[PDB]
Design a protein around this nucleic acid. Structure first.
Lengths: 144, 49
RNA sequence: AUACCCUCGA
């Protein structure tokens, strides 16, 4: 028996049992975005949909009549620059930076592992994701 | 046509199109719209829409 | 002080 209800009891006329408690109301939005972001990454991040899915979708790049590819490694989400209240006060869109690790591997076009020069480094800041707030919304230019 | 020594990965990728697309979707898409905040119930029924 | 888009009322 919780403390909040101890203040006022509603007389309920329920003549049927509560087999299942009402689920969280905004889960349909919060689940989708947190699955799209994949904040929790293991040694192998989940192969499900998301930014990771799109990056793997565009992973192999073959140069036109050239021996050079851009392999993608796991991306790294940035840290929020501002707190959501601060963004509402200022209009900072509550965004978080996005960065990914890519490897530029060139070859000698000898149909084998020739001209071994693999340059792997974290790519440029590929924009910023708005990082939906805990209440199911997100701030864009100071407006919810 | 650029060389592996002549070009670095940070200098090849231009991130402007992806940022522009994300901003356009998040600010001007039909499904992106201001939350109805006159009621706490309005917010719930807007997010479950 | 011009065009679209969204939402709402009868």
């Amino acid at each position: 028996y919780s403390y909040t209800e101890k203040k006022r009891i509603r007389k309920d006329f329920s003549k049927l049992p509560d087999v299942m408690d009402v689920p969280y109301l905004l889960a349909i939005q919060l689940d989708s975005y947190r699955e799209f972001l994949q904040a929790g990454a293991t040694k192998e991040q989940f192969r499900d949909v998301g930014l990771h899915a799109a990056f793997k979708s565009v992973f192999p790049i073959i140069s036109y009549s050239g021996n050079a590819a851009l392999e993608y490694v796991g991306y790294r989400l940035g840290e929020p620059a501002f707190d959501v209240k601060e963004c509402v006060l200022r209009g900072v869109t509550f965004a978080v930076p996005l960065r990914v690790k890519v490897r530029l591997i060139i070859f000698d076009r000898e149909s084998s592992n020739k001209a071994i020069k693999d340059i792997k480094e974290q790519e440029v800041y590929m924009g910023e994701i708005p990082l939906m707030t805990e209440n199911g919304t997100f701030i864009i230019n100071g407006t919810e | 046509m650029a060389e592996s020594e002549g070009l670095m990965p940070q200098d090849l990728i231009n991130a402007k199109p992806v940022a522009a697309a994300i901003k356009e979707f998040f600010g001007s898409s039909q499904l992106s719209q201001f939350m109805d905040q006159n009621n706490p119930l309005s917010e719930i029924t807007h997010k479950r829409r």
